[PDB]
Design a protein around this ligand. Structure first.
Ligand code: NA
Ligand code: NA
Lengths: 245, 246
């Protein structure tokens, strides 16, 4: 009926990509002593694969590291392993249906391993939120965001986070049925992938077969200066969107 | 030795990224029947990690997949497993010190596993070769190329291929001791990372601490159209480099 218990506590509720997560894994031994092989932490989320017009959600590990190595835990004994790790820059934003979880794996040799799970909210990176606010000012509204299968981009992760906006102005209603953005965040800036009418076209996921028929894709890099510069950001974004008229 | 044998044969020895590699894994049973758990192929290379000014080279897996699952092979028996896979777009170019190998892993249950090794030459993709020709035309000469540890860029692979050029003209000698380019190739175009005087500054690998003090980095995306018109390419590259004349 279980002996040793594990509990992870992060110091904050909210982080954005690039920020340092700090916390502590608390372990308390049970009635009789057990041999602990290691304590691992993982950040994970899920992403969608659509097959034959039905959704499959698949777990994916964003980051993983070892909190501690082997030690023996004796009766009732209390141990604290403090940790820190950096949130990867491709960590998805917690909005819509996207959740990001911190999973603690405490491995017990012979043994039934113990685990913990802590949701973390991942906020939009400042540059990303600048882009988003700029986009909504132009006459758009954020409708959906979800992690979608993206083998086509051959990224570190198997998925990308797809932001789907709906036009709130007559002009953009006329231009498109909806707008799609992918953010690829790096240390020096941000790359944006633009697409339109993906829902209209009944497209899900990002696959080779969508660009084989000579469809092509708008892909634009912004540097830090541009992203922190608000005004010209909205107008360059307007310029990019105008190519869809 | 009358033991179980594996031999992998590719149809070509040379490919560029995005191209399909085809071949066959040939297996021959040894004197005694064995249970084979699987046959895997691995595409791999090595990259440099510098610590305290010493080079350590570390093995890295570019791609991996299962050619076949479990079967029993009888003595002297021959099996052929044909295969195909696509060379990932971040596969490094085989030039300088870079090697790319296809490794066959035949796992035998209890058992001494068998292996094969086939080098492949990975050619510069045409857009990259356009950039390379463009850079040398401006007055550079390609000096070194290697795979370098690069956690800073957080790519799919732990390394990037770093191309180092040496200035061959008075103008560019006056500008720099050397130029460094990183190509990040994708389906719709190509991204170039520019840096100068990394060797002069004794920098190896791409790390957070190199850009924390307010060093900055030139990072520019080119599309397919731009990459395939060579003139406009050299003048764009000339313009990008002009920011270093300062
Ligand atoms: Na917890
Ligand atoms: Na071979």
């Amino acid at each position: 009926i279980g002996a040793a218990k594990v509990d992870t506590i992060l110091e904050k509720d909210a982080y954005f990509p690039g920020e340092e997560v700090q916390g502590t894994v608390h372990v308390k031994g049970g009635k009789i002593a057990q041999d602990i092989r290691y304590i691992d932490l993982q950040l994970s989320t899920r992403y969608v694969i659509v097959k034959d017009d039905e959704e499959h959600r698949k777990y994916a590990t964003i980051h993983s590291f070892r909190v501690t190595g082997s030690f023996t835990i004796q009766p009732g004994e209390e141990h604290q392993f403090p940790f820190t790790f950096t949130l990867p820059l491709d960590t998805p934003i917690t909005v819509g249906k996207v959740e990001v979880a911190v999973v603690t794996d405490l491995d017990i040799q012979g043994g039934i391993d113990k685990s913990d799970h802590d949701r973390i909210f991942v906020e939009a990176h400042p540059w990303i939120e600048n882009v988003l606010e700029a986009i909504e000012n132009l006459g758009f509204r954020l409708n959906e965001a979800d992690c979608e299968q993206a083998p086509y981009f051959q990224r570190r992760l198997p998925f990308v986070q797809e932001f789907e906006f709906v036009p709130t102005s007559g002009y953009y209603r006329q231009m498109l049925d909806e707008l799609e953005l992918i953010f690829l965040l790096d240390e020096d800036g941000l790359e944006i992938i633009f697409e339109v009418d993906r829902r209209a076209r009944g497209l899900r996921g990002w696959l080779e077969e969508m660009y084989n028929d000579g469809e092509q894709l708008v892909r634009v890099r912004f540097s830090q200066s541009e992203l922190e510069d608000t005004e010209e950001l909205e107008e360059v974004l307007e310029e990019i969107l105008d190519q869809y008229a």
